[PDB]
């Protein structure tokens, strides 16, 4: 209380996110350099962004598999406030990211999309790591799964644990009553901010909603 | 059939890893593109390595985790030969990746690390997907964990399922006739080529021992 709004950049080229950050950038608190980004662009995303922006959140979801230390470390020596790494990671790279994390002030979640596990989670929570993104696949989502029960009794079993939770995967406006008595930390929208007809209006709508919902 | 020999490029700019392929360029089957310069340079070093060497397998190391046709597309339009995909990925995000290699006449490895199941292992085959990269996590490495008899069994399994098994992680020659008897596809060395007193001779080695061990 208040979930924050975060835009997620998943454009291939810079030019591309700038469409949208020159619209929306102040109508959200957390500006996400989406992975489509960091690979299309590289780090240079993460500086560019924070730059321009550095009264907001920035940040970096590369979704770190390995290398923690290493690729938090240039992360956020490009300026990111905040970097993800993927569920299955070792447990030492997830721990590796959040200790680089910790020398800039910055933090680390754990991106829940595809495959994992409640052990998993319990690890994560015994090493210090206090944000969790529960993410719908961009792919499981067309290929038709819809949010459901099921997830909303996950996303309160990992608040409950001691996480901060972020929801993301596709969300629509009207999905968000469905997460209501929830203290979700953050809402992310890429797609129904991006590609709206108005950006603008999509995203003070999704803060709208969200101020009614948890007001 | 000789277990070929890739070299990762594990650096964060183009230029530190223009140092190492200078000298191993023809000396390895395989040219990676590292995760660590996927981030730090984009999808560019994909493009510009395939210039450089137009007639070398180029991997570009993703590790994609979600949006499997979309950054697999990119990897493939900057003229990619292999692209990975993390375990943990829906297995729709590897489906997806997988239809657009085909595309490209390329093609897709499962990077294994984190947890993983064996049901999983048995959706990738049935999705087509002949390639895992069996890997030891950098970060793993750093914390103690060896290269034990739980990983041959696992990669010997992995074999029998009908995938070619790549086996990476700090591997080191000494670390070779651990493998002998299976039919490894591939090798990965990115620091211990890398950074190497001589590079050209750390790929040398590698040959040899290989030859050796399964000649
Ligand atoms: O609302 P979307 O277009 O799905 O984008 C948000 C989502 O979190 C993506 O950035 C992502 O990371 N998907 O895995
Ligand atoms: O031999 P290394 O320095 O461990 O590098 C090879 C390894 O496969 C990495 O490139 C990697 O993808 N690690 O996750
Ligand atoms: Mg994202
Ligand atoms: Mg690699």
Redesign the pocket.
Known sequence: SLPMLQV?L?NQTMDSAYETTRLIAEEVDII?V??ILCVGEGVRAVRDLKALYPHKIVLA?AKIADAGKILSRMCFEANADWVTVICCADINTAKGALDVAKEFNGDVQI?L?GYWTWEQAQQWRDAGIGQV?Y?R??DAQAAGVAWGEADITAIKRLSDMGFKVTV????ALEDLPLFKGIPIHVF?????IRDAASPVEAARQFKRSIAELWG
Chains 1, 2 share one sequence.
């Not at 993301?168 to 969300?171: A, D, R, V």
């Open positions: 997620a998943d996400e989406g992975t979801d991106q999309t993104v993410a696949s961009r993301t995967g596709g969300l992310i929208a890429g797609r129904s």
